[PDB]
Amino acid sequence: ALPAAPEDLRIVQGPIGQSIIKEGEPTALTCLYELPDELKNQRIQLRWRKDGKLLRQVELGGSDARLVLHKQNGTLSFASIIASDAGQYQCQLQLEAHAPINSSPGILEVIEQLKFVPQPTSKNLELDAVVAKVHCKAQGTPTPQVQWVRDGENTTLPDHVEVDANGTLIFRNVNSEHRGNYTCLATNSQGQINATVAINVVVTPKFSVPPVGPIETSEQGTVVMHCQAIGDPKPTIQWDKDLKYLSENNTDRERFRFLENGTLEIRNVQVEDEGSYGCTIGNSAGLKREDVQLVVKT
Ligand SMILES: *[C@@H]1O[C@H](CO)[C@@H](O)[C@H](O)[C@H]1NC(C)=O
Ligand SMILES: *[C@@H]1O[C@H](CO)[C@@H](O)[C@H](O)[C@H]1NC(C)=O
Ligand SMILES: *[C@@H]1O[C@H](CO)[C@@H](O)[C@H](O)[C@H]1NC(C)=O
Ligand SMILES: *[C@@H]1O[C@H](CO)[C@@H](O)[C@H](O)[C@H]1NC(C)=O
Ligand SMILES: *[C@@H]1O[C@H](CO)[C@@H](O)[C@H](O)[C@H]1NC(C)=O
Ligand SMILES: *[C@@H]1O[C@H](CO)[C@@H](O)[C@H](O)[C@H]1NC(C)=O
């Protein structure tokens, strides 16, 4: 129950009753004011509120951003409208220790861009994964309907593929038939947008020929240890000793032979050659390692 503000302090041109603006467009809401000279040194605040919440304020009397409030004329200016700018706006002229002067409210409606939020992207699913999900959400005016189809010659979603009420594409017990290009369509009266994404099915490496040991030999003998892998993408193999990689850069080049088929052959075995040798198999999907003990008998 604060005292009323003086009559010469007033909002001359408040916001328009209703504005409709397209997302991406600039706009501005008005709050032209008259500030009498006998208050120029008082604490006077011009505030803009959105849905009842303070949004911008500037002191009018005593002591590149997208959304700014201009001191001289009270304009709330939007350099570019975004969907969340929609709401009910009101400006206030507030002298310290007095009742605020309230403008009429102004409704700001935004014609939203038809677009995905966010835009679906390509995914790699693990073979035999129990559940895998690909979200699809869009905005627009009105809110668009979202659906999934398969791209290409056969548009039907494979078995154990479904779309839930949120537009989420769901794969159950991922198998090789799930691989393909899948299209999310968002449709309303503004048109239709189409995000097609690659859904690949990958397989972490597995040993087809794992290293097998213990490998026992005598000094000056020759040993071989094997490593071959399968997977999708085609895995690479890498030899280590005690988790330290092995190559020509750190082994005797006339004794250690790294064959193309994954086999490691050690000629003229020495006592120091003993230890734990490992093969790591890897692709873009994952990694595995298996090790073997090399025993050198005196
Ligand atoms: C208020 O002043 C600013 C700064 O010059 C200007 O950009 C804006 O257009 C003005 N408001 C109106 C409604 O003209
Ligand atoms: C299209 O794909 C579905 C789902 O995998 C399958 O059941 C159907 O037989 C396919 N149709 C043709 C003509 O290949
Ligand atoms: C849809 O999303 C909401 C969250 O907005 C969640 O609570 C609900 O469980 C989801 N529905 C399904 C079927 O996943
Ligand atoms: C998707 O389309 C691209 C381009 O046509 C093609 O190379 C690819 O094999 C298709 N399928 C997947 C799973 O990416
Ligand atoms: C979706 O867009 C792709 C291009 O990315 C196109 O090849 C495909 O035919 C479109 N699908 C539909 C149902 O419009
Ligand atoms: C790799 O090739 C070498 C030489 O031909 C052979 O001795 C070895 O057994 C091969 N490894 C496997 C796992 O076949």
Residue numbers in the entry: 246 to 308, 327 to 561
What does the primary publication say about this deposited structure?
Drosophila off-track or OTK is a transmembrane protein that plays important roles in development and reproduction. The intracellular domain shows homology with receptor tyrosine kinases; however, the kinase domain is probably not active since conserved residues implicated in autophosphorylation are altered in OTK. Functionally, OTK has been reported to bind Drosophila Plexin A (PlexA), a receptor for the axon guidance molecule semaphorin 1a (Sema1a).
We crystallized the OTK ectodomain and determined the crystal structure of the last three D3-D5 domains (OTK3-5) to 1.97 Å resolution. The overall architecture of OTK3-5 is arranged in an extended conformation with substantial curvature resembling a boomerang shape. The asymmetric unit contains two chains, and structural superposition of these chains revealed that D3 and D5 can re-orientate relative to the D4 domain by 28° and 40° about hinge points located in the D3-D4 and D4-D5 linkers, respectively, giving clear evidence for interdomain flexibility. The interdomain flexibility is presumably allowed by the small interdomain interfaces and a lack of strong interactions between the individual domains. Sequence analysis of potential protease cleavage sites revealed an internal furin site RGKR at positions 235–238, located between D2 and D3, suggesting that the ectodomain of OTK1-5 was cleaved by furin protease during crystallization. N-linked glycans were clearly visible and unambiguously fitted into the electron density at Asn336, 417, 429, 444, 457, and 524. A close inspection of the electrostatic potential on the OTK3-5 surface revealed two substantial regions of basic charge on D3 and D4. In the crystal structure, both basic patches interact with well-ordered sulfate ions from the crystallization solution.
